[PDB]
Symmetry: C2
Subunit: 440 residues, 2 copies
């Protein structure tokens, strides 16, 4: 933050959102290609594959980020991850041209796509973690209140980038043609890399035994704070889809003139408005009234609202079944935006304070590695959370409610939200118990 800290932060947000946009675009491209040509298993997939692939990218994040920050530095890390992304986008014309496929699966299509997906996940995770670390370092050199403000703005920028990604890739790759849908990601990546190269003067670079063993004692005390985050991430990830499932069972209203995937963006637009309100209102009042949320009570209050979000979800659940007992209806569909706003309060109070929390036990030897493993907690809660959904879907019944739009089945939506509240309360009870041993 020499003189253009505003321009540096803005460029960071732009390059991050464009990276996320290109990521979603190329993932949808490769998934569609795999489903189309032969790919003998065909993936057996049309949608929801993107979420599990982002979870797999989060799973691959820790080792890639660790390698990047231990054997490549911090600037060359993003540089080479973006270069591997250029390699993936230069493999993309093989997806475009039929000669590419004829040369891929004309000899020893499947393995080259496996390698491309692996490299793409590694590069995306590395560039995400390293841009987060860049912004964090810049704002820690700037100020602590500025650090919190920039973390909130960075999460808001991630959300806006995901929204614009969804909309623009859907529009381009479904409306006009395919070659434009192939040149949009490569062009956005090129212009984001140009912006990043134009921002290298205002960016501050940093250089890459018994001191390494001392880091293990720091790991054995912060990991219990992070291994207990997996149950919290396991609970929230199905709520990102069950809230869509709960909203799908309601009568949608017609006011002011893909629907099943728009509710996925509905959880994101809630974060798009909660952060600007929390940044300008909650931040000043939290300093004057002296609530003392020293980056840990904020995370505990978020999951408290997260458990309360399940309370409003469970209360709304029984309110839907009691109307059926009266003898289908919207079932207070407008009463779902508060719990959608409440889960956004839980998300803004667990991600942004959690991101700032990870930089408290940072010590600057593996600062990028602790960020990759932090995103891994979400991916583990995503894959195992989706596996818990998939396990309760085919032979389970507890997640088989989507069939027959939840009319006659062993749905047990009341038992799931009630058991999820118990798991969330246990996760909240275990966290405060571990947080009590954290300060010790």
């Amino acid at each position: 933050p020499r003189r253009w800290r505003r321009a540096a932060g803005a460029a960071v947000l732009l390059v991050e959102m464009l990276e996320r946009a290109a990521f979603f675009g190329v993932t949808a491209n490769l998934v569609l290609y795999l489903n189309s040509t032969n790919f003998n298993w065909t993936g057996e997939q049309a949608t929801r594959a993107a979420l599990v692939f982002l979870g797999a990218s989060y799973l691959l994040a820790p080792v890639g980020g660790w390698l990047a920050d231990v054997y490549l530095g911090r600037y060359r890390a993003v540089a080479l991850s973006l270069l591997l992304y250029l390699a993936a986008s230069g493999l993309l014309p093989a997806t475009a041209f039929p000669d590419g496929r004829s040369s891929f699966c004309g000899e020893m299509c499947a393995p080259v796509l496996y390698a491309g997906l692996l490299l793409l996940g590694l590069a995306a995770s590395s560039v995400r973690s390293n841009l987060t670390s860049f912004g964090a370092d810049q704002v820690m050199d700037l100020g602590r209140d500025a650090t919190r403000r920039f973390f909130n703005w960075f999460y808001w920028s991630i959300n806006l980038g995901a929204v614009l990604s969804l909309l623009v890739v859907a529009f381009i790759q479904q409306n006009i043609s395919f070659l434009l849908g192939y040149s949009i990601p490569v062009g956005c990546v090129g212009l984001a890399f140009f912006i990043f190269l134009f921002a290298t003067p205002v960016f501050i670079t940093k250089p890459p035994p018994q001191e390494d063993i001392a880091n293990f004692q720091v790991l054995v005390k912060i990991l219990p704070v992070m291994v207990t985050l997996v149950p919290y991430w396991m609970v929230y990830f199905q709520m990102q889809s069950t809230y869509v499932l709960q909203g799908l069972h309601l009568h949608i209203p017609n006011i002011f003139p893909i629907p099943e995937a728009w509710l996925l963006l509905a959880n994101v637009v809630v974060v798009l408005i909660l952060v600007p309100l929390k940044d300008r209102l909650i931040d000043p009042l939290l300093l004057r009234c002296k609530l003392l949320p020293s980056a840990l009570q904020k995370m505990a209050l978020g999951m408290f609202f997260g458990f309360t979000s399940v309370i409003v979800a469970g209360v709304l659940e029984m309110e839907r079944l009691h109307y059926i007992h009266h003898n289908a209806a919207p079932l207070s569909i407008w009463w779902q935006i508060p719990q959608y706003l409440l889960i956004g309060i839980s998300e803004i109070f667990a991600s942004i304070p959690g991101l700032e929390f990870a930089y408290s036990e940072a010590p600057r030897s593996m600062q990028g590695a602790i960020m990759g493993i932090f995103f891994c907690l979400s991916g583990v809660g995503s894959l195992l959370g989706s596996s818990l959904v998939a396990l309760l879907s085919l032979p389970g019944g507890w997640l088989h409610c989507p069939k027959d739009f939840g009319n006659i089945n062993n749905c047990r939506m009341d038992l799931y939200f009630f058991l999820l509240a118990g798991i969330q309360a246990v996760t909240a009870l275990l966290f405060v118990w571990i947080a009590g041993r954290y300060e010790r």
Copy 2:
């Protein structure tokens, strides 16, 4: 514990159980008399008055115990409380003889009964707290493991005394006559006082500024641990009646050949068997496996089982409504004994560790006062808990389920158990948060 610590402990248990028996007997006697003669309001009461009167006794416990331990000592405290009990039992012939009533409410029946009830509550609370303090002092002079064993045995003896009280007072005062029902409490009190006077040699007596101000700093740090116990006591006391209400809505089975009040004893007999199993099995394994439950994690684990007891209660709740949706039945009435055993595990892990917890921040100037205010937390959770039940009964509906045996009403039993789980989880979250500041 000079040589007859076994006999001393046994005499303590006997005098405590006989005191509780006489207490229940005389309370039922006075309630029946008030309801019978005129007592213009008539109490508007037939049953459930005993619970609220025990809650009022708990409310009066703190000031009485404080006066007893600050201006009377410890032995003279029990002595004069039992003497006031003799005064109440000598007022009881006025309840018996009609001339007593003609002289009471022939001039300035109501005020003498108010004074008698006040003195009876004060004496009962004082003798209970002082017998608890006597046993605690004896076993702390004996040993710590012996202290925990005797606390468990003392709670078990309280439960057995309540059971024998119920059964014997019901049998005598309903089967044969009334004069025997009047001589049973006075005779039991006399023989218990004789046993106590026979045990004074083995009992060890104890004698009754800036040091008093220093006790306030101890109060401002242990009260938040105890004010947060009121929500836990507020949650459990309706569960002592809602479990009876939930069991009343089921089809009772016929096996091996007052029913609505027997389930109140069903929660007590569960404690009558859980303590002997916990004393001989849980105590040895807790020492060898090194779980380190240093009198606070035990209390936190109890409410964790208490919240889990609501989980099994809530899961059983939706299991009862789902059968009605299938289209009344026992609704797995035998699946209620685990949650009855689970709430007994929560009770044995919150009372006995809580009693031992109160003696950790004891310091021996007001050791009897901290026990009276501890029982006051249950009474406050009892009266306000019953008030919450009464508030949700007439205009509420959430507790109006007993009417029409929960067939057609605004029962909302699913919303109550779900909201009670949230309040219990908040109480559990607030406790661990306060317990974290306790060791600090």
